[PDB]
Amino acid sequence: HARSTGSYSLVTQQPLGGKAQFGGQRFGEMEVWALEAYGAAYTLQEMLTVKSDDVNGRTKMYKNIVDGNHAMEPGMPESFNVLLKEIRSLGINIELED
Amino acid sequence: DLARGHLVNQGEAVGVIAAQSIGEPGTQLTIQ
Amino acid sequence: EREEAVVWDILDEVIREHPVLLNRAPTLHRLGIQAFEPVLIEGKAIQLHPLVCAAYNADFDGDQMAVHVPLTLEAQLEARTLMMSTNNILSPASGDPIIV
Amino acid sequence: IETIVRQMLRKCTITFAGDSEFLPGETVEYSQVKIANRKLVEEGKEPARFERELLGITKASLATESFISAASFQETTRVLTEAAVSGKRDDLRGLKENVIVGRLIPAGTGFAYHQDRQAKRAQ
Amino acid sequence: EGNIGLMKAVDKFEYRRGYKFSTYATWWIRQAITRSIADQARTIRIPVHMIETINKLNRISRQMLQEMGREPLPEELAERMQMPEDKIRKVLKIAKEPISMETPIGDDEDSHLGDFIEDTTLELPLDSATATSLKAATRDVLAGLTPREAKVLRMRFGIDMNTDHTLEEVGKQFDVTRERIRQIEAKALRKLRHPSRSEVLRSFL
Amino acid sequence: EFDAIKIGLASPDMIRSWSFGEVKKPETINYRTFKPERDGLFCARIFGPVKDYECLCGKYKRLKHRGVICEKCGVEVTQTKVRRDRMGHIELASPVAHIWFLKSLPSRIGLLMDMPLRDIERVLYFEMYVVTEPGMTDLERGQMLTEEEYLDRLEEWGDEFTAKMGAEAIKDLLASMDLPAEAEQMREELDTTNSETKRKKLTKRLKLVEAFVASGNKPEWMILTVLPVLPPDLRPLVPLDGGRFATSDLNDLYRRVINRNNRLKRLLELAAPDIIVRNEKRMLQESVDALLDNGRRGRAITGSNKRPLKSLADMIKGKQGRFRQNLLGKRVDYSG
Amino acid sequence: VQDAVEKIGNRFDLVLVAARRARQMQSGGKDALVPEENDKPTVIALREIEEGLITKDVLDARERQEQQE
Amino acid sequence: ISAAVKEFFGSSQLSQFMDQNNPLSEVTHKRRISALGPGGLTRERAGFEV
DNA sequence: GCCATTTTCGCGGCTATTTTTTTACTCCCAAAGTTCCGCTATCAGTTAGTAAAAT
DNA sequence: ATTTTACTAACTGATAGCGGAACTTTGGGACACCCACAGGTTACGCGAAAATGGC
RNA sequence: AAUAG
Ligand SMILES: [Mg+2]
Ligand SMILES: [Zn+2]
């Protein structure tokens, strides 16, 4: 199996899972630990943001690669926004400070 | 830094390395 | 989609010096992910260097590996400089060679 | 193993309150006490007296400063309830928080980046 | 809901009639409970008349299943209901409750249906790149035209503008002339249709 | 962009500020047109349009009218992704205790009010009265009265004292607390104490009280009056192949809450007997507890599939929760 | 990449400097100071660092010169 | 009654999609005994002795 | 009022690949809001024709 | 003298509005007497911490 | 659930 870009989840906005759905591989916790142990911060940020759930960032990354620029503009993963919304729905004020 | 042979560099996540190093071999574990 | 020959030449030129990340589950330590230079082969199976198998705990009895493509220049240089198999030949747990 | 043991010895119970903002019988982080004691010695005032505590890896993980990492580990309801009643603030200093929020981890290639920010906040 | 019905029954009891309170109150309690079921038992609300139609369809289907020994086909149910078969099929598919997104898929137990639902509203990155390319190509083609014709076409199609414009306000630019604006737009389209300056835009069809 | 994440209690005003409207009906979508119903759990007037730059009317249907609210419908002409961000609110007819600040041991309400959890539940479950304003009477704050005793002392004293029962009583008790005074009292009592058990108790309670004083939170915010409502696109009702619909359990929980709230309002409008009103208040509390954390209070509410409904706590927690399934690890593109 | 880490000292710093140089050769119009030999910008930057032509101070100095001009 | 029998025959844990790679797979599947299922053990809760 | 014993609470590896489920049931009527077909009427676009101009 | 084009008027389609009757939809009512519920469950095990009990 | 590592 191989995938570059395809379908995405409805809520988490992450790639689907499975060869039947043309999904992507799961970069689990232990893979993140391996990347942290190496020190590959930029590879890890690519995996977290522009390959999984940064909706604007992943489109910008595809356009940049098509233009031959190979640069990313990471943003906030959608799963974190979902987490903020559910914690707020539990009647708890969670917010980001500048 | 055991994986590199020289003194450890700044920014090396040594805690993750320590945890992985300890955890990986866990499967092998059971007057003259 | 039509798989023209010029597409294959373009693919060779693309992968000429683009490192690719190989992973095997469970990733018990950081040597479970390493970067390699890809050589295009006819077939459907990934060819793995023997001397790295001990790092991956990988044997050829049905094992499957995942492959990831670093996109940006920083990720490519991290793959070449930190995660490349030639850099990781000592065990971070003990300092002993791992490609024996 | 010494790194893990260091992470096990991270808390202290205050035996003498002194004049620092610490109550007797309070389990607080050792680094905070050390910084406060350095400041008070610079001010020439009575320092706090503490007894260091050894916690298990699970308890030490659950008693970290950041509630994002503690919630991501386990016992999410307890961690979130305690943080909500306390009004805690997470400065995103470790790896897990920056992984969750999509930022560069403060280790390796991202380390310098974070350092630069700590300069700009200082200025 | 039955308690509310009972209060309504107490509000309008008549002891002169000689009947006991249970006789009258049972009707109101039944009505309140059943109306509450009709109004609040479904994620997608079905009106009361359709609820009665569905329930009586179920009763007739159960009696016919007892009668003939196999499931009643829609035409037989339609004949017994004195209703069209199309109405029967309508009632049949609108009488299904929504499925849960936590329901396992297949024989699994750690799988969930919601894990396999796409986001059909998303735009493919190939399409976004094609849109950007079309914008660039249109700008380049317009750059090879007279500024008046380029501006007229831009206003008439809304390119690089918030709104599209009709011939009247395009005439309002310099000379308010619908027949003239129409002619210059036709000229611009004719020049853009020439094969010399249309091979770039032909590839987007 | 941001330098820290701040957590704390949510005030009713904060929950109203988050909200773009009030959910008044348990309706979701029409059964024929499949369009959102007004003032429902999927209202386009509250949460946003269902199509990009359109209204339910179909009158304003382009980018030329961006940001314009249709007078016939009320749907703002904007994008559809706003339905993943816009929240709503429900104005509860009676206050409801928050299950996390009540049953997640140790109980914060009990620790702050220095009353055992069993007594708090007895007041909440409408089994025992509690004195809110003792007045010019021998009665003390927080002392429990049975219905018999409450009637006796109501005849005895009259309107001198106020005694309540339920979450309103706990809210009144929490609102009347003087936090600096309590902090001073615990400090003074800790000065002149010798037993280590009582020392532990007072040090824990003093930590809680001074945390409340420093944080700016108010204790009565642990009792909910306005209930936030999640964006619809995070609890979707989407069509499957063949006309079937897939839904989230949060819709069932929210519908239960809204129905019980509306029934409470209608019972109060009808001036029902107090037993029915107490029953409805118990059911409202149970529904909100099920929505927040299912199974913590008691028997977990189950759906038609005979399995417990998944609540917000289950959304955020566990091995299969958001932290571990989607945040610490992800599915990625450009992989094989 | 032993020569590059010897010339820089830290692998992370080497990665950052090589990324800046590769972005200069790819996104910017800057030309390579060594024979390209049909190599990607990352490998060209690594070779330049190994040869001692590119360092962090050199990059900062050239940026300052560009800003002055 | 029909609901009960279809539940058992289609959605039970012991009603399994038949193994049909070869004749031996079918024979072995029909002669298989599970400790799991309704009224049995659980994978995670089962111990060494069983 | 502290020392021990019983009761909840939370936890129990990672990647893949095969596949939906199933009980339970009044009716009628009057009043109200909505829809669906048909017709009207206006405006804008398109097209055919003819004169005006240019070769 | 002929050919191309610009101007103009007529046709036609889309569309907003309206009529009105059929259609869907909502709320009220029903008078032998009926008067306290489920409702499956569980062969986990371990460690902590929190709540009870003992004198 | 079953299967592979
Ligand atoms: Mg093997
Ligand atoms: Zn509208």
Swiss-Prot record, chain B:
Recorded family membership: Belongs to the RNA polymerase beta' chain family.
Record's subunit section: The RNAP catalytic core consists of 2 alpha, 1 beta, 1 beta' and 1 omega subunit. When a sigma factor is associated with the core the holoenzyme is formed, which can initiate transcription.
Annotated function: DNA-dependent RNA polymerase catalyzes the transcription of DNA into RNA using the four ribonucleoside triphosphates as substrates.
Protein name in the entry: DNA-directed RNA polymerase subunit beta'
Gene: rpoC
Boundaries of the shown chain within the full protein: 902 to 951 of 1401
From Swiss-Prot, chain C:
Family, per entry: Belongs to the RNA polymerase beta' chain family.
Residues that coordinate or bind Mg(2+): 59, 61, 63
Lineage: superkingdom: Bacteria
Protein name: DNA-directed RNA polymerase subunit beta'
Protein's organism: Vibrio cholerae serotype O1 (strain ATCC 39541 / Classical Ogawa 395 / O395)
Binding partners and assembly: The RNAP catalytic core consists of 2 alpha, 1 beta, 1 beta' and 1 omega subunit. When a sigma factor is associated with the core the holoenzyme is formed, which can initiate transcription.
Function: DNA-dependent RNA polymerase catalyzes the transcription of DNA into RNA using the four ribonucleoside triphosphates as substrates.
Endpoints of the signal sequence: none
Residues represented out of the complete protein: 402 to 501 of 1401
Swiss-Prot record, chain G:
EC number in record: 2.7.7.6
Enzyme class: transferase
GO CC list: DNA-directed RNA polymerase complex
GO molecular function: DNA binding; DNA-directed RNA polymerase activity
Keywords linked to the UniProt accession: DNA-directed RNA polymerase, Nucleotidyltransferase, Transcription, Transferase
Domain of life: Bacteria
Any one Gene Ontology BP term: DNA-templated transcription
Organism: Vibrio cholerae serotype O1 (strain ATCC 39541 / Classical Ogawa 395 / O395)
Catalysed reaction, written as an equation: RNA(n) + a ribonucleoside 5'-triphosphate = RNA(n+1) + diphosphate
Complexes and interactors: The RNAP catalytic core consists of 2 alpha, 1 beta, 1 beta' and 1 omega subunit. When a sigma factor is associated with the core the holoenzyme is formed, which can initiate transcription.
Family according to the record: Belongs to the RNA polymerase subunit omega family.
Metal-binding is among the record's keywords: no
Descriptive protein name: DNA-directed RNA polymerase subunit omega
Cited function: Promotes RNA polymerase assembly. Latches the N- and C-terminal regions of the beta' subunit thereby facilitating its interaction with the beta and alpha subunits.
Transferase listed as a keyword: yes
From Swiss-Prot, chain H:
Included range, full protein: 498 to 547 of 1341
Purpose of the protein: DNA-dependent RNA polymerase catalyzes the transcription of DNA into RNA using the four ribonucleoside triphosphates as substrates.
Organism (species): Vibrio cholerae serotype O1 (strain ATCC 39541 / Classical Ogawa 395 / O395)
Quaternary context: The RNAP catalytic core consists of 2 alpha, 1 beta, 1 beta' and 1 omega subunit. When a sigma factor is associated with the core the holoenzyme is formed, which can initiate transcription.
Protein's name according to its UniProt entry: DNA-directed RNA polymerase subunit beta
Family: Belongs to the RNA polymerase beta chain family.
UniProt lineage: Bacteria, Pseudomonadati, Pseudomonadota, Gammaproteobacteria, Vibrionales
Gene: rpoB
